[PDB]
Design a protein around this ligand. Structure first.
Ligand SMILES: *[C@@H]1O[C@H](CO)[C@@H](O[C@@H]2O[C@H](CO)[C@@H](O)[C@H](O)[C@H]2NC(C)=O)[C@H](O)[C@H]1NC(C)=O
Ligand SMILES: *[C@@H]1O[C@H](CO)[C@@H](O[C@@H]2O[C@H](CO)[C@@H](O)[C@H](O)[C@H]2NC(C)=O)[C@H](O)[C@H]1NC(C)=O
Ligand SMILES: CCCCCCCC/C=C\CCCCCCCC(=O)OC[C@H](O)CO
Ligand SMILES: CCCCCCCC/C=C\CCCCCCCC(=O)OC[C@H](O)CO
Ligand SMILES: CCCCCCCC/C=C\CCCCCCCC(=O)OC[C@H](O)CO
Ligand SMILES: CCCCCCCC/C=C\CCCCCCCC(=O)OC[C@H](O)CO
Ligand SMILES: CCCCCCCC/C=C\CCCCCCCC(=O)OC[C@H](O)CO
Lengths: 558, 28
């Protein structure tokens, strides 16, 4: 608003200079006629004598230079002393801004450009990593999973923030690189300008900033969910087959409780009661609880695993699987039988070859998919993704609402306040700007919420690790690792730079301290990219495999 | 601090342009 204030004040000087000159009386001697040499207002000045008027009030630094004067010599010929190329000349040397400030401004110009190249590099490489991470997740078709969908949207917010910062600095060069042509050029520059673009981009940055906070809260929320929701082999079959606490009868006629646990093949239901008592060690009349059923089911899986290892066709594939995909195999040996699953020769081969995508396509081309498409969809997903995601209730719709809905509630009201009451420069102003808190409240609330869930997560992770419940190979541990590093990585940054950026006094020290914070935070995109994509073992494996199929393709054949 | 830096920078660019308009008033 300094360029805007000065052009308005100079036009005012220009207008009221002509009026002030009109009311002057006609001369009585040889005089230099009343003029406005576009810089100052000159009255009728007698020949030889030098005129002196106070510095023009339209100047931004008028407050300081207030008492000084501008001079102009009137020639002995009656016309004003002209310049070298016959131009309007005057001595406004003592109306100029402080020589000390011009040198200091030349120094701030160097550091603003020096700091710009540095953070532009940081933002460029963190954005580059992000686009590559989104390309990888997307390309490998791994964006189906609830975890990856969250990561992609977290990446999208870090893309938006980083990219809108570069657009703002880019537009600021484009605008201020322009030359002061004429008064028409200035009028076109201020009024009919792309100052709107600057501000549209600022809104995307503000939204970027808050959405970053929200998408990191949903990471903590999704993890807090996964850890509590401890899905196992028993849980998937309690869904697929169903738990039956009372004494039921199997399809063949014989008595069977829980998840198809046979007691006696004979039709004697009275004798079956005495057989059930042998397992737990006490009388139950014919009904067992959840803890009794899952302890008894863990014998069925131990018995089914034994058989799979004794089977020459199933043992090669079984060993080349993780604990989750093994559960999907043990699951279909429960519905199909041991000899039945051994029939999936082609599918089992590619499931051993880790070709999860094409394995899932021909497993769906099976006669088994047609008979039970519901149960097949879930186990086919478990083989494709290596996660219990198909057997867990997703809150993904909520997560989009938290991640993108919540910043929406505060950025657009802010953008309205900004539009009416604080429509100045580029709108990027973040702290102690009056109604700064409109955008700070949602982030304060997200760090506060994200703090309490972190503690709950670490409390429940320590407990689950001490109870040998979670093994260092389970995908939940691997996800827990990258999430529980990112949260204290970003958390500590906030705490530290709250003391580092305590420099309130305007200068180069303040500017470098401001730069220190923003520079270290420019790499954040690269952090989320490595943690949620590049360090992912499954992503690393798929890329390694798709590269070896390329190494055989264009080298051996072509 | 990004927004706060970009802010001070634009506050500067504007003040820098304002004095350069005064150079235009002094030369024409
Ligand atoms: C005297 O100073 C003023 C500067 O504006 C000029 O005088 C005007 O001259 C025009 C003719 O060009 C007349 O129509 C006006 O009546 C004059 N203004 C007044 C209020 O007298 C001119 O540049 C200067 N020269 C003289 C001697 O007129
Ligand atoms: C601006 O120039 C004028 C010349 O007209 C200065 O005023 C004269 O100063 C003399 C000093 O001998 C005094 O008689 C009067 O104050 C002025 N002359 C008359 C009779 O009006 C004035 O000082 C200059 N202003 C400054 C300080 O820049
Ligand atoms: C990748 C690096 C992109 C270029 C570095 C930054 C740059 O050259 O532009 C910023 C600044 O405006 C230059 O003075
Ligand atoms: C990696 C590419 C390094 C970019 C460095 C660069 O281009 O420097 C900008 C120049 O110094 C602007 O003043
Ligand atoms: C991948 C995207 C790389 C961006 C390169 C770029 O243009 O850097 C920013 C700009 O030059 C300076 O404001
Ligand atoms: C966790 C913080 C640990 C080290 C940060 C040390 C920061 C060094 C800055 C001095 C600490 C301070 O009190 O900040 C005042 C500010 O620098 C002047 O206004
Ligand atoms: C690590 C972050 C490095 C922060 C850079 C600050 C800096 O370059 O200090 C400039 C100082 O003004 C000297 O000319």
């Amino acid at each position: 608003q300094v360029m805007d204030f000065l052009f308005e004040k100079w036009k005012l000087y220009g207008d009221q200079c002509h009026h002030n000159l009109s009311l002057l009386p006609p001369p009585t001697e040889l005089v230099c006629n009343r003029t406005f040499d576009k810089y100052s207002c000159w009255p009728d000045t007698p020949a030889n004598t030098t005129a002196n008027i106070s510095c023009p009030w339209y100047l931004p630094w008028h407050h300081k230079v207030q008492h000084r004067f501008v001079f102009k010599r009137c020639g002995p010929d009656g016309q004003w002393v002209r310049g070298p190329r016959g131009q309007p000349w005057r001595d406004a040397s003592q109306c100029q801004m402080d020589g000390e400030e011009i040198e200091v401004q030349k120094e701030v110009a160097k550091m603003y450009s020096s700091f710009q190249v540095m953070y532009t590099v940081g933002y460029s490489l963190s954005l580059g990593a992000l686009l590559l991470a989104l390309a990888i997740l997307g390309g490998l078709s791994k964006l189906h999973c609830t975890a990856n969908a969250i990561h992609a949207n977290l990446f999208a917010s870090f893309v938006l923030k980083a990219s809108s910062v570069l657009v703002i600095d880019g537009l600021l060069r484009t605008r201020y690189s322009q030359k002061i042509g004429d008064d028409l050029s200035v009028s076109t520059w201020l009024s009919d300008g792309a100052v709107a673009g600057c501000r549209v981009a600022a809104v995307f940055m503000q939204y970027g900033i808050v959405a970053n906070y929200c998408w990191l809260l949903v990471e903590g929320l999704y993890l807090h969910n996964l850890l509590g929701l401890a899905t196992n082999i028993f849980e998937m079959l309690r869904i697929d087959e169903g738990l039956r606490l009372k004494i039921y009868k199997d399809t063949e006629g014989y008595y069977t409780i829980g998840i198809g646990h046979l007691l006696t093949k004979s039709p004697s239901l009275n004798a079956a009661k005495s057989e059930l008592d042998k397992a737990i060690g006490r009388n139950t009349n014919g009904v067992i609880t959840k803890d009794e059923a899952e302890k008894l089911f863990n014998q069925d899986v131990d018995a089914a695993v034994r058989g799979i290892l004794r089977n020459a066709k199933l043992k090669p594939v079984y060993d080349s699987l993780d604990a989750v995909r093994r559960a999907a195999l043990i699951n279909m040996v429960f519905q199909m039988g041991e000899t039945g699953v051994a029939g999936f020769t082609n599918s089992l081969r590619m499931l051993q070859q880790k070709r999860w995508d094409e394995a899932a396509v021909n497993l769906a081309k099976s006669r088994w998919y047609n008979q039970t498409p519901n149960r097949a969809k879930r186990v086919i997903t478990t083989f494709r993704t290596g996660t219990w995601d198909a057997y867990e209730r997703s809150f993904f719709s909520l997560y989009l609402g938290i991640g993108w809905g919540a910043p929406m509630l505060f950025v657009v009201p802010w953008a309205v306040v900004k539009c009416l009451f604080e429509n100045v420069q580029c709108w990027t102003s973040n702290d102690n700007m009056g109604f700064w808190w409109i955008l700070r409240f949602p982030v304060f609330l997200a760090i506060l919420i994200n703090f309490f869930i972190f503690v709950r997560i670490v409390q429940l992770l320590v407990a689950k690790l001490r109870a040998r419940q979670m093994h260092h190979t389970d995908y939940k541990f691997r996800l827990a690792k990258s999430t529980l590093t990112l949260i204290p990585l970003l958390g500590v940054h906030e705490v530290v730079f709250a003391f580092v950026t305590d420099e309130h006094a305007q200068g180069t020290l303040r500017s470098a301290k401001l730069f220190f914070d923003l520079f270290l935070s420019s790499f954040q995109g690269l952090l989320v990219a490595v943690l949620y994509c590049f360090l992912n073992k499954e992503v690393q494996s798929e890329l390694r495999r798709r590269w070896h199929r390329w190494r055989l393709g264009k080298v051996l054949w072509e | 601090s990004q927004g706060t830096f970009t802010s001070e920078y634009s506050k500067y660019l504007d003040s820098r342009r304002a004095q350069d308009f005064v150079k235009w008033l002094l030369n024409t």
